[PDB]
Design a protein around this ligand. Sequence first.
Ligand code: HEM
Ligand code: HEM
Ligand SMILES: C[C@H](O)[C@H](O)[C@H]1CNc2nc(N)[nH]c(=O)c2N1
Ligand SMILES: C[C@H](O)[C@H](O)[C@H]1CNc2nc(N)[nH]c(=O)c2N1
Ligand SMILES: Cc1cc(N)nc(C#CCN2CC(F)(F)C2)c1
Ligand SMILES: Cc1cc(N)nc(C#CCN2CC(F)(F)C2)c1
Ligand SMILES: [Cl-]
Ligand SMILES: [Cl-]
Ligand SMILES: [Gd]
Ligand SMILES: [Gd]
Ligand SMILES: [Zn+2]
Lengths: 401, 401
Amino acid sequence: FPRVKNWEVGSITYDTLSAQAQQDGPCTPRRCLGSLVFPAPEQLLSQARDFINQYYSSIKRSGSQAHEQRLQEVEAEVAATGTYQLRESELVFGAKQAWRNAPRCVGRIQWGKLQVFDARDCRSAQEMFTYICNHIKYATNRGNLRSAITVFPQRCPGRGDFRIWNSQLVRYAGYRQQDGSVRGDPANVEITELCIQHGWTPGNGRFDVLPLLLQAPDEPPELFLLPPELVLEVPLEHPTLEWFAALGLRWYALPAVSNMLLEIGGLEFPAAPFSGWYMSTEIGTRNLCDPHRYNILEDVAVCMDLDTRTTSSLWKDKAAVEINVAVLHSYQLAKVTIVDHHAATASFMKHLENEQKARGGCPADWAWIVPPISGSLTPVFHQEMVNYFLSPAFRYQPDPW
Amino acid sequence: KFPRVKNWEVGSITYDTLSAQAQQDGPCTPRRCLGSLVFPPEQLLSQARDFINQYYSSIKRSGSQAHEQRLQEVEAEVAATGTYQLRESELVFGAKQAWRNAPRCVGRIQWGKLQVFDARDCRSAQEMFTYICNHIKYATNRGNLRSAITVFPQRCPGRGDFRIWNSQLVRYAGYRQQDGSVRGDPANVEITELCIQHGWTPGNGRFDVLPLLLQAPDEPPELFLLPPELVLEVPLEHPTLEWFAALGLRWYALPAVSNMLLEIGGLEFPAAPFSGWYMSTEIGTRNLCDPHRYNILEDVAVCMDLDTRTTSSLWKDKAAVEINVAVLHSYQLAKVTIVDHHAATASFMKHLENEQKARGGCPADWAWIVPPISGSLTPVFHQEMVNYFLSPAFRYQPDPW
Ligand code: HEM
Ligand code: HEM
Ligand SMILES: C[C@H](O)[C@H](O)[C@H]1CNc2nc(N)[nH]c(=O)c2N1
Ligand SMILES: C[C@H](O)[C@H](O)[C@H]1CNc2nc(N)[nH]c(=O)c2N1
Ligand SMILES: Cc1cc(N)nc(C#CCN2CC(F)(F)C2)c1
Ligand SMILES: Cc1cc(N)nc(C#CCN2CC(F)(F)C2)c1
Ligand SMILES: [Cl-]
Ligand SMILES: [Cl-]
Ligand SMILES: [Gd]
Ligand SMILES: [Gd]
Ligand SMILES: [Zn+2]
């Protein structure tokens, strides 16, 4: 059992939970690959068997009547159908566990507070769109954001997958330019090209909300415009740098990851978008300052009259700090939930302590938990972590195209 | 089986074929990643053969002349005596490769310019002290810092061991109180008490330079007062924050790691202090702002009149940047070689490209390469990395008690 040390405090714990790591990651004793971004009824049976055990442990009825009844039921159903169906409570628990188990989520103190919308009866792309709008509207909640997931029909034999082609419910267009560059968000060049290819009349701003490409089984993807009044955005201003609002920068309220696969007891839900609220560094640092994203850092530093001709002035660090300040201030001003990296990392530390008592550890991806600015200023920096894959889980999956 | 390594800023792809060598085994298994953890007879001929084979390939002398010959004399040396002495150039080429191989060192673009002081004919702590004092003064070089390593005698059975008891050659004192807390540096507190244990007059201050506990084989350590004019220090002031100097902060010029164990061709040098120059964030972020080090962050933020009542003011971030600005500014005013984390990671990205062409990859510990502030503002953040143990190497070793 890996011994884990907190270097800021001296704390020591052992991650007994890591021994239950089912699926396997990319590292070997020869070489660590932790920093990489992207790391049969019998086996369906034992995954299902394991999850059902989990579910019944969680309701304090392990080994009971209902427990072994469900095991037999599930085995029987897999024998007769090659698959099985989750009960609603099992689904709700499975979706919460998936979040709980997500090693790159610093917001997992909230894992228990998750609104699960059962959309497993969804029938078409059009019903899928309606479910998604209700998700966005519920989650956005006029700026007082609520964590939610909508679970669309599971992968099953004989039929294609429901898929959301968009990587998030809210993304901004990225238009490749005349002069080879990108107007708007460069992370979204491909999906934007796809949207046009599927009949979207493009805009040409930098914060053009993308339409949804929604794929029903054995269907081509279908284009759906989000109603503007459903997409709550936050124009970005700075509490003190008044020229900051003249940048015309905006970000949207709702972070809803929509391209990931939800895995519960061997069952696969290729379409299950989930949403929480942002940590300010995702917007302030990554989305806006990443060289390959909005890349505003030099424009901000020049405006701030920093000396951008030498690195030792720390103009990058200073412009980024203020960009994060603007994000926090703007979202607070707009009354849209947001958590700064100091609050978030502190609550994640409480999550780690809660998880150690409850489960004997917690899967955590240090490189993803430590915020991209001010890393060692947050407590998670000095906390060793064990990264491993627990199921239920959100997993990456290839793009549908 | 050759890890695809990607840079997400540029989209460029490489493969780490060098990982295929990994002589020792790291702490990760397919089941759990432990990459974030700080501290994770004639076997000697295998490591000796291998090292000599490297040496001769690197001078384009694979399979020729003194290659075969030197292979015999190590054979015969171990055969006769149970060990061997390195040819002077080998001691030099292994010293450089060990630095070249250090996954956690961001400054390895300098791996080829290293001054190796051969202290292998050392005997007694009075001999070490002048070897160390020669190093220190050579390396300090009036602030024009020069990478150096003094290699003390290798390890043999039946005899004791050369060990420097301090983690660095220059460490500040840390004294406890009538209220438990520490005046000075809490990272040293332990070695500070051993110095007082072995008869050192404890200073009062928050930056008393610790003496040296030097240990010749099978002898108790001997305290040594470092020559004060030999300990180059930089008082810290800020270019525009006039009161910063009044905080009485200082740091030493020379970062000289004096507790690690150099391992070349299977030989083990438990005293081989290496030194280079500081990256500013080591001092400004970790040494001064870590809660368990000097923990000055709030003091500086009070002085800057920042809103420490909410974390979303990013007062920690702002104060931290200025402390780094002061460190850079102070070192450049005293004309002491320092490198900001942007210049350093930029040069490390150049090092990676070099090592790709040269050795087909490079062992890099992402969590240690990415700086403790503004991580994603530096290019290494967006650079996937493969971590693995190559030989020769600097290794951690137990405290000599
Ligand atoms: C409520 C507040 C939440 C906060 C503050 C938060 C925070 C974060 C952050 C900062 C990341 C890293 C994303 C990046 O840097 O690209 C992340 C990733 C992730 N989160 Fe959370 N999150 C929240 C809610 C949720 C919810 C509701 C779920 C699932 C039901 C979830 C599951 C995940 C997953 C699977 C990832 C990895 C996604 C990826 O690799 O792109 N999170 N979270
Ligand atoms: C000359 C410029 C150099 C720079 C800018 C530099 C920078 C750094 C930094 C920032 C670290 C991280 C250590 C920490 O944060 O605690 C590090 C670690 C390390 N470096 Fe370098 N370094 C330099 C020279 C050297 C030399 C000359 C050697 C050996 C001959 C070396 C070998 C190592 C080793 C073994 C570590 C890991 C030590 C530990 O675990 O505390 N470096 N370096
Ligand atoms: C290459 C590198 O591992 C990659 O850029 C990662 C590092 N850590 C991260 N951490 C978070 N939270 N989000 C990210 O997108 C990344 N990107
Ligand atoms: C817990 C964590 O692994 C530990 O604090 C590491 C992280 N990265 C680091 N990186 C550097 N350069 N130096 C350090 O001391 C650390 N500490
Ligand atoms: C639920 C949630 C909350 C949050 N605070 N952040 C995220 C995120 C993210 C990662 N991004 C989206 C992608 F494009 F898929 C990669 C997700
Ligand atoms: C050669 C070198 C250069 C540099 N720029 N940094 C370091 C360092 C370090 C690690 N610190 C010192 C300790 F106390 F041993 C832990 C070492
Ligand atoms: Cl995002
Ligand atoms: Cl240091
Ligand atoms: Gd102003
Ligand atoms: Gd004042
Ligand atoms: Zn690993």
